């Protein structure tokens, strides 16, 4: 039985979840630490090439 709860508005009625019949619509961040290393490496390479410009 429902009691005294807030009225839910969860907004999840489209096909976002990948299943056997749907491609889905999602985004994850498993590449976050690898991309952090890549951006720093590019900045260091660019500094070496354009030396001594700021």
Which listed residue (43, 48, 49, 53) binds RNA by CB under 7 A? Answer: 43
The string of DSSP codes covering the chain is ---S-PPP-----SS-S--SS--------TTHHHHHHHHHHHHHHHHHHTTT--
28 in contact with RNA (CB under 7 A):
yes
**Binding-site member from 14, 23, 27, 39 for RNA (CB under 7 A):** 39
Task: Give the footprint of RNA on this chain (CB under 7 A).
Answer: 1-3, 5-6, 8, 10, 12, 15, 19-22, 28-36, 38-40, 43
């Amino acid at each position: 039985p429902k009691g005294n709860n807030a009225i839910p508005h969860v907004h999840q009625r489209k096909h976002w979840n990948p299943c056997s019949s749907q491609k889905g619509n999602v985004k994850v961040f498993f590449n976050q630490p690898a991309q952090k290393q890549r951006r720093r490496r590019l900045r260091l390479l660019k500094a070496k090439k354009i030396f001594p410009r700021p």
